[PDB]
Structure formats: C-alpha cells, structure tokens
Enzyme design. Structure first.
Site, mmCIF file in Angstrom:
data_model
loop_
_atom_site.group_PDB
_atom_site.id
_atom_site.type_symbol
_atom_site.label_atom_id
_atom_site.label_comp_id
_atom_site.label_asym_id
_atom_site.label_seq_id
_atom_site.Cartn_x
_atom_site.Cartn_y
_atom_site.Cartn_z
ATOM 1 N N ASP A 93 0.886 -1.189 0.000
ATOM 2 C CA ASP A 93 0.000 0.000 0.000
ATOM 3 C C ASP A 93 0.916 1.228 0.000
ATOM 4 O O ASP A 93 1.115 1.886 1.033
ATOM 5 C CB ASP A 93 -0.967 -0.040 1.164
ATOM 6 C CG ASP A 93 -2.088 0.988 0.975
ATOM 7 O OD1 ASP A 93 -2.126 1.627 -0.082
ATOM 8 O OD2 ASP A 93 -2.905 1.122 1.932
ATOM 9 N N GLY A 186 -9.008 9.270 6.438
ATOM 10 C CA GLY A 186 -8.448 10.567 6.075
ATOM 11 C C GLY A 186 -7.037 10.783 6.560
ATOM 12 O O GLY A 186 -6.385 11.734 6.103
ATOM 13 N N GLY A 189 -2.173 7.294 4.078
ATOM 14 C CA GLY A 189 -1.156 7.861 3.193
ATOM 15 C C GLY A 189 -0.146 8.741 3.894
ATOM 16 O O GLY A 189 0.943 8.966 3.371
#
Ligand SMILES: O=S([O-])[O-]
Ligand SMILES: [Ca+2]
Length: 240
Positions: A93, A186, A189
């Site tokens: 990922d 949110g 990343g």
C-alpha cells in the site's frame, strides 16, 4: 487522528494534504510525505479512484488561509506494481506522486527523512502519527493538523491472534492499540514519524484500521513499512 493533540504549525513540515476535485471545490482525502521537491509518498489505496488530485504543502488549517500553503498538481502516479485494491492485507500500500512543479522549501515545507533499508523498530519505540483524518470513528475531519503519540507494536505481538493475526505482514508496522489514540479515515497515506538517533524519520505510511472502528483496543493502526521499499522508491525516482 482519534485522541490527538493539535500539532504546532512548524512541527511536521513534510506532511502534505492530498486533495481531489469535488465539483467547484477541493476535498482532503489522504495524507502524504514530501520526499523530494517534486515527489510525494502516499498510500496506493488513496489514488485507486481516477480523480483529479492536487497536493498542498505548508498546510495547517484546511479551511483557513495560513499564509504558508503551496498548491501543486499531480503529474504522474506510480503505484507499487504488486498493489491489489481488493487485498489491502497483502501489503504494497504505497505510491509515489510526481508533482507538476518543484515546491519551495522553507520552515513549513521540508523533505521527510527516510529510514535505511531493512530497519526494524524495537517494540514500544516512540512515534507520532499526524493527519487531518476523522477525530472519532464515523466522525468528521479535523480542521487543524493533529498528532498522537503511537508507540510501535512489534511484528510478533501484532501478528498474534489477540491483535491482528495473519492480516498483518512483516512489510507493515503496527503502532498504538491502546483504545484511545489511533489513525482514522483521512489519515491514510500520511506519515508515522519515529525518533531514531535523535532525528524523526518517516517509518510508516498509514494504511488501515479495523472495520470495527478507528480506536480499538489491540487493533493498532497499520502502516506500510517504508524501510521495506527503499530500493523501489529510489528506482522510481531515478527512472522518472
Ligand atoms: O483512505 S481512507 O481509508 O483514509
Ligand atoms: Ca490553510
């Protein structure tokens, strides 16, 4: 971030907001880390939708002018070749975004420090998660950047049946799991910043939390282990 504290404006200058175009406006969807003046590291899952993305560096308050922001388009998306949208538990990922222009470095915009290849953190190593993600399970985004202290849980503990079991892989870092503090939607990343030899380095890319909620006892937040991907990152940047 559930259970965070507000971050100072200049604490985490490699943090970026990854935003997509939503009609006439831009919406925050994920975090990321600035790793070169024209490259951002984020989660692959954040860029599975074929949307228009931009990056904001120097951001603190998503909803107010801070006087420090630079806004830059995304010119190329390079997802890890082994990423499978349907299998987040397989890992990989991670994605790299080439920016349309180089950003200007200053006290609010700095490169993140990456670990040496293969580095594994001892259990209970000091780390912070940062992001604008939800502040409660099924809540709302933060307006200002949040931080939470999120010490690591080593692979042996994290992969044990009362934690994540076989869902976690050695290509991941677990942190947290106290039932109070966590990443949440949110935050994906974004960075996990861990203190090593006096310096904060970015050891994780936020990947997933439990389907049962963000802050769940013995379900630590799970990150892509950046030190597993140093060769890949260096190869992408060198060939693009
Ligand atoms: O991508 S969402 O899971 O933060
Ligand atoms: Ca702002």
């Amino acid at each position: 971030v559930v259970g965070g504290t507000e971050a100072q404006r200049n604490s985490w200058p490699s943090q970026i907001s990854l935003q997509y175009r939503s009609g006439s406006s831009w919406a925050h969807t994920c975090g990321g880390t600035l790793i070169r003046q024209n490259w951002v590291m984020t989660a692959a899952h954040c860029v599975d939708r074929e949307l228009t993305f931009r990056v904001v560096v120097g951001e603190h308050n998503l909803n107010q002018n801070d006087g420090t922001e630079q806004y830059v388009g995304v010119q190329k998306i390079v997802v890890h070749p082994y990423w499978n949208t349907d299998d987040v538990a397989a890992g990989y990922d991670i994605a790299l975004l080439r920016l349309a222009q180089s950003v200007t470095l200053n006290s609010y915009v700095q490169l993140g420090v990456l670990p040496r290849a293969g580095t594994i953190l001892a259990n209970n190593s000091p780390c912070y998660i940062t992001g604008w993600g939800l502040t409660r399970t099924n809540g709302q985004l933060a307006q200002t950047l949040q931080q939470a202290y999120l010490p690591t849980v080593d692979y042996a503990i994290c992969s044990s049946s009362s934690y994540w079991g076989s869902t976690v892989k050695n290509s991941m870092v677990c942190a947290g799991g106290d039932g109070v503090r966590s990443g949440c939607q949110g935050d994906s990343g974004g960075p996990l910043h861990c203190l090593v030899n006096g310096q904060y380095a970015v050891h994780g890319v936020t990947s997933f939390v439990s389907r049962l909620g963000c802050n769940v006892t013995r379900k630590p937040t799970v990150f892509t282990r950046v030190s597993a991907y140093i060769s890949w990152i260096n190869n992408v940047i060198a060939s693009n």
